[PDB]
Design an enzyme around this catalytic site. Structure first.
Site, PDB file in Angstrom:
ATOM      1  N   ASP B  37      65.040 -61.031 -30.383  1.00 41.19           N
ATOM      2  CA  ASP B  37      64.838 -61.578 -31.581  1.00 41.19           C
ATOM      3  C   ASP B  37      64.731 -60.468 -32.657  1.00 41.19           C
ATOM      4  OD1 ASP B  37      64.883 -64.409 -31.356  1.00 41.19           O
ATOM      5  OD2 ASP B  37      62.759 -64.282 -30.723  1.00 41.19           O
ATOM      6  N   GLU B 110      59.238 -63.373 -42.247  1.00 43.26           N
ATOM      7  CA  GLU B 110      58.017 -63.085 -43.030  1.00 43.26           C
ATOM      8  C   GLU B 110      58.108 -61.874 -43.714  1.00 43.26           C
ATOM      9  OE1 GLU B 110      57.185 -60.688 -40.486  1.00 43.26           O
ATOM     10  OE2 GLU B 110      57.141 -62.415 -39.603  1.00 43.26           O
ATOM     11  N   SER B 145      61.276 -70.395 -40.234  1.00 46.35           N
ATOM     12  CA  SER B 145      61.527 -70.085 -38.767  1.00 46.35           C
ATOM     13  C   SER B 145      60.768 -68.839 -38.241  1.00 46.35           C
ATOM     14  CB  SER B 145      63.078 -69.704 -38.601  1.00 46.35           C
ATOM     15  OG  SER B 145      63.403 -68.565 -39.369  1.00 46.35           O
ATOM     16  N   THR B 148      56.663 -69.157 -35.997  1.00 48.78           N
ATOM     17  CA  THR B 148      56.383 -69.073 -34.812  1.00 48.78           C
ATOM     18  C   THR B 148      56.103 -67.466 -34.604  1.00 48.78           C
ATOM     19  OG1 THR B 148      58.837 -68.941 -34.248  1.00 48.78           O
ATOM     20  CG2 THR B 148      58.073 -71.016 -34.232  1.00 48.78           C
ATOM     21  N   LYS B 152      51.902 -67.432 -36.752  1.00 47.68           N
ATOM     22  CA  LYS B 152      51.230 -68.382 -35.819  1.00 47.68           C
ATOM     23  C   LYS B 152      49.874 -67.554 -35.477  1.00 47.68           C
ATOM     24  CE  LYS B 152      51.748 -70.983 -31.414  1.00 47.68           C
ATOM     25  NZ  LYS B 152      50.672 -70.205 -30.988  1.00 47.68           N
ATOM     26  N   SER B 153      49.986 -66.369 -35.210  1.00 45.79           N
ATOM     27  CA  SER B 153      48.881 -65.747 -34.807  1.00 45.79           C
ATOM     28  C   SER B 153      47.853 -65.502 -35.872  1.00 45.79           C
ATOM     29  CB  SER B 153      49.510 -64.137 -34.623  1.00 45.79           C
ATOM     30  OG  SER B 153      50.467 -64.277 -33.532  1.00 45.79           O
TER      31      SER B 153
HETATM   32  N1  LIG Z   1      50.536 -60.430 -34.283  1.00 49.09           N
HETATM   33  C1  LIG Z   1      51.765 -61.093 -34.150  1.00 49.09           C
HETATM   34  N2  LIG Z   1      52.104 -62.241 -33.442  1.00 49.09           N
HETATM   35  C2  LIG Z   1      53.275 -62.597 -33.523  1.00 49.09           C
HETATM   36  N3  LIG Z   1      54.469 -61.943 -33.930  1.00 49.09           N
HETATM   37  C3  LIG Z   1      54.147 -60.695 -34.798  1.00 49.09           C
HETATM   38  C4  LIG Z   1      52.817 -60.409 -34.917  1.00 49.09           C
HETATM   39  N4  LIG Z   1      52.732 -59.046 -35.612  1.00 49.09           N
HETATM   40  C5  LIG Z   1      53.978 -59.270 -35.861  1.00 49.09           C
HETATM   41  S1  LIG Z   1      54.442 -57.680 -37.000  1.00 49.09           S
HETATM   42  C6  LIG Z   1      52.667 -56.873 -37.131  1.00 49.09           C
HETATM   43  C7  LIG Z   1      52.466 -56.345 -35.730  1.00 49.09           C
HETATM   44  O1  LIG Z   1      51.581 -55.466 -35.791  1.00 49.09           O
HETATM   45  N5  LIG Z   1      53.378 -56.673 -34.730  1.00 49.09           N
HETATM   46  C8  LIG Z   1      53.324 -56.371 -33.389  1.00 49.09           C
HETATM   47  C9  LIG Z   1      54.188 -57.375 -32.335  1.00 49.09           C
HETATM   48  C10 LIG Z   1      55.533 -57.253 -32.748  1.00 49.09           C
HETATM   49  C11 LIG Z   1      56.455 -58.428 -32.320  1.00 49.09           C
HETATM   50  C12 LIG Z   1      58.115 -58.283 -32.565  1.00 49.09           C
HETATM   51  C13 LIG Z   1      58.410 -57.142 -32.813  1.00 49.09           C
HETATM   52  C14 LIG Z   1      57.712 -55.955 -33.085  1.00 49.09           C
HETATM   53  C15 LIG Z   1      56.256 -56.004 -32.965  1.00 49.09           C
HETATM   54  N6  LIG Z   1      54.859 -60.072 -35.425  1.00 49.09           N
HETATM   55  C16 LIG Z   1      56.145 -60.236 -35.547  1.00 49.09           C
HETATM   56  O2  LIG Z   1      56.669 -58.880 -35.375  1.00 49.09           O
HETATM   57  C17 LIG Z   1      58.030 -59.043 -35.957  1.00 49.09           C
HETATM   58  C18 LIG Z   1      58.828 -57.903 -35.769  1.00 49.09           C
HETATM   59  O3  LIG Z   1      59.836 -58.088 -34.630  1.00 49.09           O
HETATM   60  C19 LIG Z   1      57.514 -59.537 -37.036  1.00 49.09           C
HETATM   61  O4  LIG Z   1      58.693 -60.167 -37.960  1.00 49.09           O
HETATM   62  C20 LIG Z   1      56.463 -60.206 -37.075  1.00 49.09           C
HETATM   63  O5  LIG Z   1      56.508 -61.673 -37.605  1.00 49.09           O
END
Ligand SMILES: Nc1ncnc2c1nc(SCC(=O)NCCc1ccccc1)n2[C@@H]1O[C@H](CO)[C@@H](O)[C@H]1O
Ligand SMILES: Nc1ncnc2c1nc(SCC(=O)NCCc1ccccc1)n2[C@@H]1O[C@H](CO)[C@@H](O)[C@H]1O
Ligand SMILES: Nc1ncnc2c1nc(SCC(=O)NCCc1ccccc1)n2[C@@H]1O[C@H](CO)[C@@H](O)[C@H]1O
Ligand SMILES: Nc1ncnc2c1nc(SCC(=O)NCCc1ccccc1)n2[C@@H]1O[C@H](CO)[C@@H](O)[C@H]1O
EC number: 2.7.1.23
Lengths: 261, 250, 263, 263
Positions: B37, B110, B145, B148, B152-153
């Site tokens: 993703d 987002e 989209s 999720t 969601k977190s």
């Molecule tokens: N707690 C969260 N639970 C779910 N998803 C998150 C969260 N946090 C984020 S961004 C803020 C953070 O500190 N993220 C670390 C987790 C992450 C995830 C995917 C890729 C890189 C980094 N995103 C999604 O990470 C995506 C980046 O690939 C962003 O688009 C967030 O939606």
């Protein structure tokens, strides 16, 4: 045209009702509760809900008006001090029509099937013991829920019971429904999504029994026990509730005045 | 005309070569990402200025993703289907983010706003009307989209991508007498504009998907559902709620 | 010493009970369901709760033991296969006692007189029919006016039960406390509430006072009965505690882990 | 006796500080900034936290007093209008002591130790935050999210509250762990519920892939390289407050989150 007014039952609403009806004595307005074209509710959102279900057969030919004698409501958003201005504006006919989505609730048994319309929400709980159902989304199993129950809300209903259950608030222009959990025990044996789920049109959320087949099914204010339940289906109804719009009272302002102030 | 983006590892690059055998990087009609993703998000931001002429396909070399829907081994039949031109397009809503000349951004997941060191205090203005004064870590505005993901977190609701809307969630709101907030996630339809206006500190950390850039001298941040959509090339039927089920329910 | 055994009712628990009784008969043990020193529950947590309330007038002279014939429970620690060793270790008196705090619930009326209830898990208060509105008064001082489904006050060991589903924190039962959680508070400008769960120490009293409707559905460990003309509902950590016979070491946080995370 | 006053730094706190110093000059009060017996903080809770960390080496002989120049604080619960009364009350020596528990934070890579009045958080220094949560030398869960928050009792009304944690009365010697934006999918299963640990309980956070963690203590956020273990436990050290009048903790909670009708 033909109109009628429902009252909460207290002195404030009953007197305000009679005062408004007398106001229609100076205009070409006929009182009729059999086939009204305009329905005015006086009291609270609960009173408004009774007025909705009282005429859920003539929804397409009825414009609803809500007046609150107590605190502000999301349906009864007119103050009693503006009761006079409403009568004149209503008697003239200078008003638009706003429509909100409704929730269709279908209950199958093991007879026939029963359908219900909800303005706020519909909830399913247990008949006493633990509430265990399978959640089937579009003929596809999604989760096995265990807890107190589930709540499927209308968009306008999101500010009601839905909000207290941690659900999201949705602007009623969005044709959708929202499913929230009620005290879900979330262990390894019973894993649930936790997050509130928002469903679009034509999506069917089916609740199917596992052990017990008796359920407490509520529709807005009303709640009754359904025995030998085979299935409880939820989908956004094709029917809408029509409001009479005189002024401009934004949904988000109404949310602000209720929870923020 | 098509093109293929790779994650960077040996497996994805190899699969990229193994799929390219079955090409316009400037005028593509089909974009195929290989990785996850996160990799898919990169392919989206690489072509924001021609989304109305591009269909996207995601291939997950790792775990199943919400955008990367095809398995690595299923790349064999994917080429023969993308060459015949026999596919229907699925459109997902996007989030427009304006900062104030002015800078506009597009997000698939987002966009978030936090303070660049110190307390984050902002006025939430909805349709030119004040709604709340927020104090906490920040705010998150999510696409359908994107619900999720981070949404969601943060306790946000999951909503089907066929719904054209955006969702605002809180990030650790203090929610007291001075800064009373709604608590609940807010879902806004089309043509609704949420405005974030500073109170004192005008330096904010604004993130768009994977990109977290620091902004100084910010006077206003405007959120609304974009007029642009992202198109997916659809061959099989993979229900959104199934993807949700497989990800979280196990 | 004197003992008794309660059973869930299924064939498994009934069978195990009879075998344990016969096992105990080989030692210096006497069956007595009137004045036991040791109470053994065979089934699940729900079975344990019934056994608790069956002997809540003798909590000071009883050491409870729980055996789960099904899935692991927070009160029912022992597996059915360990019943053999459990009998022997009991007969020798080779065990130490561990105590958990209990919740006291006092119901005052308008004058019939007064009623008090002990809870092992929690005590909830909801409406009999219609909006539930009460004033939350903490140590004689007003705190909030609550509107919603109801309120739930949990013991420490009860925090893994209904409390958890309602978003309450998990609290180690060595802590002498009680936790108040909201049940679907409307939390608007008229009925502004704290939202957060509240953890009260000993000697702190939480008073729920009616605003309009004086009838309430009060539940103590799923014993829900209708109380009419209620003047006040008081909550405080009881001076009475439930005692558990301890043989091995089964950490509370592992019980939590095995039940919610992975086992 | 020996006293000192810390100021927020603005015009209002500096002036009030000088005003009190002049008042104490009329009594038997010696101003000392290296060895005070009573430390007065003027500003906010943030200013109070700095005063705590400034003299955290002598918490055994220091009673703290907080004055809020702005909105009511949980540590700064004295208002500027009551400044005259405070000086007289301090000079009189008529006061009792109230002690709140503190959080011991040990970082293992040589061993680093920190004390928290509010809380200690562990975020990621870039990249996904994934750690193993170990409770008393046994694995409890594998956490993935933004971070984890370990809060003191008095700290529960702070960052802990905003994260959905429970409010806990500071007479309870405990610590509360809350999740910060956790991912709850098929791979990472966490408890979700905030966890309240008693004394002598150790919560260890062990790295999975990344060993660089952004650790904060009350708000001294520091990047720590090559971390092997982060240990959490209720400290044996306690902060002492000077008490003159009755200002209940729940009142402070009420006046801050619910309403303050007389202000
Ligand atoms: N707690 C969260 N639970 C779910 N998803 C998150 C969260 N946090 C984020 S961004 C803020 C953070 O500190 N993220 C670390 C987790 C992450 C995830 C995917 C890729 C890189 C980094 N995103 C999604 O990470 C995506 C980046 O690939 C962003 O688009 C967030 O939606
Ligand atoms: N949602 C709950 N999640 C966890 N635990 C609960 C819950 N609900 C209850 S009892 C309140 C009730 O009537 N709930 C609706 C039916 C239900 C649903 C699940 C389990 C039992 C009962 N307890 C616990 O069940 C014990 C009764 O044996 C009580 O002491 C509650 O702790
Ligand atoms: N906690 C709620 N917060 C907001 N709104 C609610 C809630 N609960 C309900 S109905 C569920 C119920 O029976 N709860 C027991 C106590 C109660 C409390 C309020 C109103 C009626 C009854 N509604 C709304 O009341 C409307 C009926 O007038 C329903 O449509 C719910 O939206
Ligand atoms: N959302 C929070 N709600 C309550 N309180 C918090 C929060 N966040 C923090 S510190 C975490 C942090 O740096 N957040 C960035 C934005 C922010 C927003 C408000 C206040 C401080 C910082 N503390 C408290 O700040 C104290 C430092 O003065 C810490 O001890 C936290 O308890």
């Amino acid at each position: 045209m033909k109109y009628m007014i429902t009252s909460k039952g207290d002195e404030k609403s009953d007197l305000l009702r009679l005062n408004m009806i007398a106001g229609f004595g100076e205009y070409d307005m006929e009182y009729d509760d059999v086939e009204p074209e305009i329905v005015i509710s006086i009291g609270g959102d609960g009173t408004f809900l009774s007025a909705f279900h009282q005429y859920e057969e003539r929804l397409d030919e009825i414009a609803f008006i809500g007046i609150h004698t107590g605190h502000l409501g999301f349906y009864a958003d007119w103050r009693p001090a503006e009761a006079d201005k409403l009568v004149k504006l209503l008697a003239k006919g200078e008003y638009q029509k706003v429509s909100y989505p409704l929730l269709k609730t279908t209950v199958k048994y093991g007879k026939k099937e029963a359908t219900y319309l909800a303005l706020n929400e519909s909830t399913v709980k247990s008949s006493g013991g633990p509430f265990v159902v399978d959640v089937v989304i579009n003929d596809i199993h999604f989760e096995r829920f265990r807890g107190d129950g589930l709540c499927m809300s209308t968009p306008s209903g999101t500010t009601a019971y839905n909000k207290s259950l941690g659900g999201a608030l949705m602007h009623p222009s969005i044709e959708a429904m929202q499913l929230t959990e009620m005290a879900s025990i979330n262990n390894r044996v019973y894993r649930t999504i936790g997050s509130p789920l928002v469903f679009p049109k034509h999506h069917v959320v089916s609740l199917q029994p596992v052990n017990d087949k008796d359920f407490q099914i509520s529709v807005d204010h009303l709640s009754i026990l359904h025995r030998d339940v085979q299935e409880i289906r939820y989908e956004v109804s094709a029917k809408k509730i029509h409001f009479a719009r005189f002024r401009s009272f934004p949904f988000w302002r109404r949310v602000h005045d209720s929870f923020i102030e």
